[PDB]
């Protein structure tokens, strides 16, 4: 019964331009644990998607400091600090608190000559 | 060692309980084995969650309990479902930490009287 | 290197079974779970569910539960997704994924 | 120390139990103090019995239980009546021996789960 | 200071009246040991009436002694009491307080009716 | 309700003569404890009674080795090993297993100018 909503289906930025990507939530994803149960993903096109941040603030291995995930407890944002062309793709948030798990809508991040 | 703290008694009507074992240790970026045992003897492992905290390792039960769970920096919450009145005993939260060394475990917890009723 | 690798592409017409393999390599297999994820072609990602590699038990997402079959040969480190009485809707790429959603498969495109 | 052995779970419908704590130690002509506690904490004494094992010393409960008892060379059997379902937890048998020295207690028991139903 | 139980004096009481008979405990701890009361009719032998729990207070009575006989303690003054009520000629006997494993007994306290 | 029974209301010995005094029982007075729950008592006349043996076999303080308590767990005997004139009196057995406790009948041990 839990519904993630990226409200920015596509977002054009140019390089160097820092951009931040939102994803809101029905319920709070905070837990007694102290952790907050949200992933962020990047599906570069063709490629299988790729974990970026986990437990909101925490960023996975082989990922640039550029990326950072900041979060209320129902609203969350994914700051990208200075946009390299490689960073372009669709970005998916996804909650992992209760079943069933629920992916966001995507937000395509297009790069602008 | 690292000290564990569990609520001293749970009393269950659902047949269904959740039981966080608060540690004094951030299991962050640590390879470990978290465990839970029934018994005064402490000789039945109800649930094992085992692996690198970095990736989110699954909880399971050889002993035959319906058992999920969720790991967090210094709590470890076991979720037992479908428990039986006849399964009221003490349960003990217990943690081994493999890597990075040096390798250590839990100083033994007071346990919890899970009291399943109805 | 931890790495998942899935069965190859599928051209299957309506009213047929299909199993899709996902073979896991480089890590202790049963220590981590295993989720499956649909991706309709122009649409995005949808969580199907996961199986406990140790216990066996699968949990299925709402829409999917029924006609879908997760299952494991654990000694050979591999996970299976089977889809039955298949219907055009079910044309997607299909990703096995584990290790905390950190490692994803190459994907597996059904029609 | 003195090692205690108790049955690992007693289960009760009488609302009454008989719970013997077998020691490895002969309490014959010793001045001692045997106790039993409720709690994972072990922080409620349910009976004391104490005195010389010579003149059969009286069990009792400050903590508020109906509680007799009978002592024997190596055994201490408590008898609890009128127990509630509210009061199913773990119970820990425990001796201190005062005389003749040297003075010693017991290495902590596993406990019994008394389960009252 | 040997252990030593010590009891009220002789009684000459006529029917249908109260009496308490005292037993004062000395030399030994006291609330650690139980306290029996024992009737002995004159040419007959010994009969166990019951005991009081010196810590808890709770008395148990032998069945024949059920009603009209009552035991009680001034616990800080180390003294116990039998009290017999609505007295009947039946009740003439010497009456023994005793404790410490029935190892220490009183003087005896001779009631007549 | 246990009924104790000394089957020997009076028994005349002469001194040196060893004697042994029986006291049988309804139930068995043995216990999981391993102990067996009999007191034996001697009320010399005028005197209050005095504990002599407790838990069948064991004899209390200030009591002669003459006195011995032997027992099958429902039948029991008090051997008195060589009768000193002092030891004359009534002897009472008394069970202490279940409430109510119960005394024996007594056995008067009479002593006789041979
Ligand atoms: C979970 O724990 C980590 C703690 O990481 C480090 O481990 C210990 C030395 C601990 O005592 C901390 O001081 C260390 O930070 C937290 O990770 C950090 O969180 C802060 C958030 O402001 C930030 O620096 C980074 O996200 C993390 N820093 C590092 C060095 O990793 C994490 O936030 C904890 N999760 C909670 C509290 O929910
Ligand atoms: C309770 O024990 C006594 C004697 O125990 C003694 O001291 C202990 C430390 C033990 O380990 C031994 O040293 C002694 O046996 C038993 O009574 C004695 O029985 C033995 C015969 O084997 C012998 O010592 C004496 O005849 C008895 N009395 C004494 C004072 O020693 C007694 O039988 C035991 N109780 C029960 C119910 O069996
Ligand atoms: C676990 O039980 C132990 C005893 O085995 C408890 O230790 C006592 O704690 C109290 C309250 O802090 C102190 O007054 C005592 O000095 C401690 N020792 C004893 C022997 O009583 C401890 O509180 C329990 N821990 C938890 C988390 O419940
Ligand atoms: C008590 O529990 C311990 C575990 O701490 C176990 O090794 C032992 O066998 C138990 N002993 C008894 C008598 O129950
Ligand atoms: C767990 O972590 C260690 C290093 O921290 C790593 O080498 C290893 O691959 C992980 N264990 C597995 C995957 O079994
Ligand atoms: C339940 O336990 C509490 C704890 O003392 C007690 O006060 C209460 O009366 C109990 N209820 C019953 C019905 O015994
Ligand atoms: C307890 O035993 C010791 C020595 O055995 C003695 O000093 C003390 O008097 C005894 N206590 C009682 C109440 O008899
Ligand atoms: C105990 O009670 C439950 C519920 O009736 C029953 O299913 C179970 O089989 C019983 N005991 C064991 C050991 O399974």
PDB file of N, CA, C and O and ligand atoms in Angstrom, chain B residues 31 52, chain C residues 26-28 32, ligand 5:
ATOM      1  N   UNK B  31      31.327  -7.321   8.260  1.00  0.00           N
ATOM      2  CA  UNK B  31      30.894  -8.677   7.978  1.00  0.00           C
ATOM      3  C   UNK B  31      30.658  -9.387   9.307  1.00  0.00           C
ATOM      4  O   UNK B  31      31.568  -9.467  10.135  1.00  0.00           O
ATOM      5  N   UNK B  52      27.634  -9.335   4.952  1.00  0.00           N
ATOM      6  CA  UNK B  52      28.179  -7.987   4.961  1.00  0.00           C
ATOM      7  C   UNK B  52      27.082  -6.953   5.011  1.00  0.00           C
ATOM      8  O   UNK B  52      26.123  -7.032   4.272  1.00  0.00           O
TER       9      UNK B  52
ATOM     10  N   UNK C  26      30.594 -15.804  -7.215  1.00  0.00           N
ATOM     11  CA  UNK C  26      31.615 -14.941  -6.623  1.00  0.00           C
ATOM     12  C   UNK C  26      31.286 -14.620  -5.181  1.00  0.00           C
ATOM     13  O   UNK C  26      32.109 -14.061  -4.458  1.00  0.00           O
ATOM     14  N   UNK C  27      30.088 -15.003  -4.752  1.00  0.00           N
ATOM     15  CA  UNK C  27      29.680 -14.773  -3.381  1.00  0.00           C
ATOM     16  C   UNK C  27      28.954 -15.976  -2.781  1.00  0.00           C
ATOM     17  O   UNK C  27      28.503 -16.856  -3.518  1.00  0.00           O
ATOM     18  N   UNK C  28      28.875 -16.030  -1.445  1.00  0.00           N
ATOM     19  CA  UNK C  28      28.149 -17.128  -0.766  1.00  0.00           C
ATOM     20  C   UNK C  28      26.629 -17.009  -1.023  1.00  0.00           C
ATOM     21  O   UNK C  28      25.987 -16.066  -0.639  1.00  0.00           O
ATOM     22  N   UNK C  32      22.361 -14.165   0.794  1.00  0.00           N
ATOM     23  CA  UNK C  32      21.660 -12.998   0.348  1.00  0.00           C
ATOM     24  C   UNK C  32      20.422 -13.371  -0.457  1.00  0.00           C
ATOM     25  O   UNK C  32      20.338 -14.447  -1.034  1.00  0.00           O
TER      26      UNK C  32
HETATM   27  C1  LIG G   5      32.356  -9.195   2.492  1.00  0.00           C
HETATM   28  O1  LIG G   5      33.302  -8.142   2.619  1.00  0.00           O
HETATM   29  C2  LIG G   5      34.663  -8.387   2.334  1.00  0.00           C
HETATM   30  C3  LIG G   5      35.520  -7.124   2.571  1.00  0.00           C
HETATM   31  O2  LIG G   5      34.987  -6.179   3.527  1.00  0.00           O
HETATM   32  C4  LIG G   5      34.729  -8.800   0.873  1.00  0.00           C
HETATM   33  O3  LIG G   5      36.084  -9.146   0.558  1.00  0.00           O
HETATM   34  C5  LIG G   5      33.839  -9.996   0.545  1.00  0.00           C
HETATM   35  O4  LIG G   5      33.757 -10.074  -0.887  1.00  0.00           O
HETATM   36  C6  LIG G   5      32.438 -10.005   1.182  1.00  0.00           C
HETATM   37  N1  LIG G   5      32.068 -11.423   1.432  1.00  0.00           N
HETATM   38  C7  LIG G   5      31.383 -12.268   0.609  1.00  0.00           C
HETATM   39  C8  LIG G   5      30.897 -11.636  -0.670  1.00  0.00           C
HETATM   40  O5  LIG G   5      31.139 -13.480   0.865  1.00  0.00           O
END
